[PDB]
Design a protein around this ligand. Structure first.
Ligand SMILES: Cc1cc2nc3c(=O)[nH]c(=O)nc-3n(C[C@H](O)[C@H](O)[C@H](O)COP(=O)(O)OP(=O)(O)OC[C@H]3O[C@@H](n4cnc5c(N)ncnc54)[C@H](O)[C@@H]3O)c2cc1C
Ligand SMILES: Cc1cc2nc3c(=O)[nH]c(=O)nc-3n(C[C@H](O)[C@H](O)[C@H](O)COP(=O)(O)OP(=O)(O)OC[C@H]3O[C@@H](n4cnc5c(N)ncnc54)[C@H](O)[C@@H]3O)c2cc1C
Ligand SMILES: *SC[C@H](NC(=O)CC[C@H](N)C(=O)O)C(=O)NCC(=O)O
Ligand SMILES: *SC[C@H](NC(=O)CC[C@H](N)C(=O)O)C(=O)NCC(=O)O
Ligand SMILES: N[C@@H](CCC(=O)N[C@@H](CS)C(=O)NCC(=O)O)C(=O)O
Ligand SMILES: N[C@@H](CCC(=O)N[C@@H](CS)C(=O)NCC(=O)O)C(=O)O
Lengths: 461, 461
């Protein structure tokens, strides 16, 4: 039984960040990884998604070429070209992260870890045992898929994982789900030329975001040529002579249900949820608490219910973002190796960008949430809607919407919501100000930058 | 003699903003304008520049088309197309601003104003006299040009004003100056295909910015194909059979001066400075103080040395930006019409974006300025240099540089400097945080947004 100061299970964002910080503090750490380092962020998430987004962005801008005095650009996107370059870039990152571990003197244990029956928390990887007074579980999650028992033929569809394996642009694609990943995929496929449908169970996408964003976002998708099938769900899928055939039930409220067949589907993409990766850990051998979805339960300091066992990131099922896993993993290392007992991540005011077209940036409370938190009488919002200067000369148009949620008399800024060109790079610094507890006067007292979209947030009235 | 509560001379940013705010407060105001409403911002500055920038941006992105899996885009930019659309957009703004005045019940007095000999401050416009207990001078400035006496043939070159009148893309262009406007013009002309030279008196452009920016900016220009003629100046200009011929002296220190002729120049653009527009105001009839450049002298509350006469904007020659004139004009109206005596603009921490390629964002103190203000021992900087993810797949490259200047033990953030893709929209919110007095811990305690360029500023080490 080889002993370490810190044993990290999972080599993704959370696991890598925590191990690296602990190593700086003097800990002798090891990272167990069964697949590729970089985990979801590098291999099948953040990075490859962003590259594909940059690609779709090129597609749109190329529609405006003629308006801007250039000659029309004629044609066919070649998926294999960018696919090959994207994969290579991912290969470059795997090698970098491996190097990052080595230079820090972190040992890399390759293989699948599982807890043992042993009294003091001990894991086994490929017959060998390993132990540490501090063990971090950061196994992330995976895409959820329907059971054939509930939706026959479900296994004919792919997930975001399968998306990153595609070698050609699908002619006809149907995306099922209404969350950010669904929105993202539909927008990329559609910009690149796939005939795309997005199938949602209600009337709007991103229903957990501020209602101004869910509304605007659903409209922007339609305007960009994505067919949004509202109040619809898949009843069954089947392999026809040429592609798939999707049976769906549409049940608009105040109406009779109607069954529709969607034929000649090349790609059926499930974007319905993510499941934690805890199933093969043997948690129960130590009685580690999970919820009924398999998520590991932790307190505010990332402690599990077992002493010296912690969990961070997607496996805990809260705020499923790379920077959250990183920050929680870092704070945890300072708590354990620097004896900072108050060291923990504040889960409020975490900013999010959704890579739609145009992109979405959000931080803090939605209008409804502030209304529930402070009372209708104590909530004031400010908002604007405009056409970015970029489109002053284009026939194609996109809008920019911004909303500021204030609370109390002081008008403390408790939430910012926007969609528009530039919003992806604009959010970060306002998130700093929101975190610091700025009020509307703080915003108003900052001189504007002209001409930009960003200045709109500092000149709201 | 028609009397008003507030008389505003000049219908640009400063004048329009002040008059509109005063009118909201109940003032009976009039705006005197001899040309077009919107002044420099609308007609020959901010707006038309930004449109041209968006156009040059299209040019660059179109170089990356093939890398991104698209077919190569072949050719010739048509200047007249965008020029016509740009002019129309400007026409649309003039009509909007005129309307904005009308709905506010602001009278518009068309013509050129000049002060009279009359005891109580009174102006005359086209034979009629006008008076008010409060008179704002917001006449802006103009491009500076050399005297034929010092540089023979100087009058063959054009200014940024003339740039907005060009009907065709110049084949060969030479820009003289090292300030933001010079940088901006060279970058637009060069991206659009003009064979461009930028002639500077020293070794770097933007010498008043942080040295990290002046260095990076000069390098980025060279990389983008702009020829930067260092330590050079124009000795004479002459009209040859086909274009202009520019005689220049190059005087590199540690070297002998060398005279060079630049032949076949289509466009010689002077971007050497701006002069205040006070020459035809008859200031001396009231003894209003100016400096030796003709700028109006004011105190911290925009008061001139004469009671009930104020000045804002470019004519005062400090922080020559549209949003500064606007903010100072607004604060002044609240002081005069809302009796807020402490109402004034703080000229510290004003943010600036330079529309280069890639764009520049700056706010607060340069490294040298903080060193002079707090002492070497009390200044700590953090910086980074990286290649934006956008270029992970392109053969063409641009860099992103960021620098944070901290002061004292607390590490208060006193200056932020960056250049890179997205920097134009990224600056605003960090400028809010800087204004509020954030420290490095405030930045560090804000969760990052991945993957973006913006996150680099919150994860500096
Ligand atoms: C398509 C997609 C797009 C996304 N886009 C973004 C985005 O733009 N921005 C953003 O912030 N977030 C984004 N996310 C979410 C972000 O990727 C995740 O929140 C983040 O990767 C979670 O990190 P983690 O460390 O919890 O887990 P992971 O990164 O999943 O790491 C888990 C690791 O543990 C390994 N492992 C699992 N079990 C074991 C075991 N028993 N033994 C050994 N190794 C094991 C796995 O192989 C893996 O490498 C996206 C996610 C997806 C799916
Ligand atoms: C090429 C260029 C690009 C720029 N780009 C930017 C940018 O991107 N962002 C930014 O923030 N700033 C930019 N600026 C600077 C910004 O335009 C100026 O700071 C701003 O317009 C100054 O406003 P103002 O009200 O002082 O004067 P102006 O806007 O010049 O207004 C002066 C007005 O007074 C009128 N007038 C003058 N004298 C009289 C008189 N005697 N009687 C009647 N009317 C009179 C003039 O016709 C004019 O309309 C740019 C400037 C230029 C030249
Ligand atoms: S996609 C890989 C992830 N990288 C990042 O999110 C960048 C993080 C910043 N550079 C930072 O906070 O320092 C990832 O998994 N990173 C793990 C890591 O240790 O950086
Ligand atoms: S280019 C014309 C200028 N407009 C702006 O700078 C936008 C200002 C913001 N909308 C704001 O601060 O409200 C300009 O000269 N504006 C004058 C005005 O009164 O808005
Ligand atoms: N600031 C935003 C919006 C554009 C903007 O600033 N527009 C001004 C002209 S400079 C406008 O349309 N003003 C008209 C009005 O007052 O509504 C951007 O640059 O996209
Ligand atoms: N955040 C910036 C920089 C890109 C970035 O985040 N790169 C990471 C990969 S996700 C990297 O190269 N890491 C290598 C390292 O640790 O230096 C952007 O998105 O452009």
């Amino acid at each position: 039984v080889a002993s370490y100061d810190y044993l990290v299970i999972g080599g993704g964002s959370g696991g890598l960040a925590s191990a690296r910080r602990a190593a700086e503090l003097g800990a002798r750490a090891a990272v167990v990884e069964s697949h590729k380092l970089g985990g979801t962020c590098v291999n099948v998430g953040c990075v490859p998604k962003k590259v594909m987004w940059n690609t779709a962005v090129h597609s749109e801008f190329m529609h405006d070429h003629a308006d801007y005095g250039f000659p029309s650009c004629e044609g066919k996107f070649n998926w294999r070209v960018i696919k090959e370059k994207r994969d290579a870039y991912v290969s470059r990152l795997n090698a970098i992260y491996q190097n990052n571990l080595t230079k820090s003197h972190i040992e890399i244990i390759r293989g699948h870890a599982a807890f043992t029956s042993d009294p003091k928390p001990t894991i086994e990887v490929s017959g060998k045992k390993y132990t540490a007074p501090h063990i971090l579980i950061a196994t992330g999650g995976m895409p959820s898929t329907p059971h054939e028992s509930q939706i026959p033929g479900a296994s004919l569809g792919i997930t975001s994982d399968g998306f990153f394996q595609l070698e050609e642009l699908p002619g006809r694609s149907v995306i099922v789900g209404a969350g950010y990943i669904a929105v993202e995929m539909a927008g990329i496929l559609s910009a690149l030329g796939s005939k795309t449908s997005l199938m949602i169970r209600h009337d709007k996408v991103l229903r957990s975001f501020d209602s101004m964003i869910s509304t605007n976002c659903t409209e922007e998708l339609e305007n960009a040529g994505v067919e949004v099938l509202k109040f619809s769900q898949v009843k069954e899928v089947k392999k026809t002579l040429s592609g798939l055939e999707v049976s769906m039930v549409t049940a608009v409220p105040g109406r009779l249900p109607v069954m529709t067949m969607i034929p000649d589907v090349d790609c059926l993409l499930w974007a319905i949820g993510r499941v934690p990766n805890t199933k093969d850990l043997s948690l129960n051998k130590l009685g580690i608490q999970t919820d009924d979805k398999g998520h590991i339960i932790v307190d505010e300091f990332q402690n599990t219910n077992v002493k010296g066992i912690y969990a961070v990131g997607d496996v805990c099922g809260k705020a499923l973002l790379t920077p959250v896993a990183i920050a929680a993993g870092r704070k945890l290392a300072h708590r354990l190796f620097e004896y900072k007992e108050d060291s923990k991540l504040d889960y409020n005011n975490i900013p999010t960008v959704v890579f739609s077209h145009p992109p979405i940036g959000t931080v803090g409370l939605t209008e409804d949430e502030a209304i529930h938190k402070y009372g209708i009488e104590n909530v004031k919002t400010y908002s604007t809607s405009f056409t970015p200067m970029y489109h002053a000369v284009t026939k194609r148009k996109t809008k920019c919407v911004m909303k500021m949620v204030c609370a109390n008399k002081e008008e403390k800024v408790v939430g910012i919501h926007m969609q528009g060109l530039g919003c992806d790079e604009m959010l970060q610094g306002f998130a700093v100000a929101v975190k610091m507890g700025a009020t509307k006067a703080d915003f108003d007292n900052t001189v504007a930058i002209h001409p930009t979209s960003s200045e709109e947030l500092v000149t709201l009235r």
